[PDB]
């Protein structure tokens, strides 16, 4: 009885504090029954995650046949778009962009959540400002886990997927740091590290750890930056850098 609907999920504004929001509105009995019970799980998760770089869920409300989920409102569009936009980040803007995603990931992990579906098309910008914040979204594939590696199903976007998941090995948190390296890799040059036309040709290249730094583009990227990628695109999970560790690197610890 507080929120007032606007255009379109769809916007809305609190009656008291008048702060714009985004309200996802689901249906009964569409979505079906246990289709709904998949959103049960999913929604619980976003409610554990209250962090500036995570599209925070603020309230969950059951009406009659419709369900309401009040989310942070983000407008700068997808990070994907901003990347095709500018072609590729500078190391500075890149350092900044990745440090934001890292802090969000870090928080997720230090809270038992693994994203899995971490990609550019799932990172939203506050605005297209020259400093705007980045927000994490889409927890459809998110799962809650202990420090113990298992085989938590097989899902994620083909291209960002981790070796350990293609080898049907047990995996945990570091599947996300792998995705980062892919992203951070893209930011610096605007093409992917692993890619082929044939899906299997691809997974092969991934599993293999097959990526390089083609000249001349990479010829002029600070080694400190490559090294940070190298350590995210470490094929052996056990030794692939963690989030809280990546946040302590020079090439990220340089606000000046």
């Amino acid at each position: 009885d507080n929120y007032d609907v606007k255009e379109e999920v769809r916007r809305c504004v609190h009656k008291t504090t008048g702060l714009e929001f985004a309200a996802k509105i689901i249906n009964t009995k569409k979505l079906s029954a246990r289709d709904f019970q998949k959103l049960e799980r999913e929604a619980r998760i976003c409610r554990k995650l209250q962090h500036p770089n995570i599209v925070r869920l603020h309230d969950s409300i059951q009406e009659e046949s419709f369900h309401y989920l009040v989310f942070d409102l983000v407008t700068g569009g997808e990070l994907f778009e901003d990347i095709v936009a500018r072609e590729f980040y500078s190391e500075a803007d890149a350092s900044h962009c990745i440090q934001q995603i890292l802090e969000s990931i870090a928080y997720c992990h230090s809270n038992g959540i693994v994203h899995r579906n971490l990609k550019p098309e799932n990172l939203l910008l506050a605005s297209k400002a020259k400093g705007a914040a980045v927000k994490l979204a889409d927890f459809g594939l998110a799962i809650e886990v202990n420090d113990s590696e298992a085989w938590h199903g097989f899902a994620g976007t083909p291209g960002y997927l981790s070796p350990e998941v293609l080898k049907k090995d047990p995996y945990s948190k570091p599947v996300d740091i792998w995705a980062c390296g892919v992203i951070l890799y893209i930011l610096l040059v605007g093409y992917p590290p692993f890619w082929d036309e044939d899906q299997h040709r691809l997974y092969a290249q991934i599993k293999a750890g097959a990526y390089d730094y083609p000249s001349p583009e990479w010829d002029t990227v600070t080694p400190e930056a490559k090294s940070l990628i190298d350590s995210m695109l470490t094929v052996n999970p056990k030794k692939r850098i963690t989030a809280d560790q990546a946040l302590k690197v020079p090439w990220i610890c340089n606000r000046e």
């Binding site: 990347i83 590729f88 994620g156 083909p158 692993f194």
Partner: peptide, 16 residues
């Protein structure tokens, strides 16, 4: 090597 720029390639897919 090279692969197409992220603009040219398009936007993900997802897998289950």
């Amino acid at each position: 090597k090279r692969p197409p720029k992220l603009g040219q390639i398009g936007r993900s897919k997802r897998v289950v």
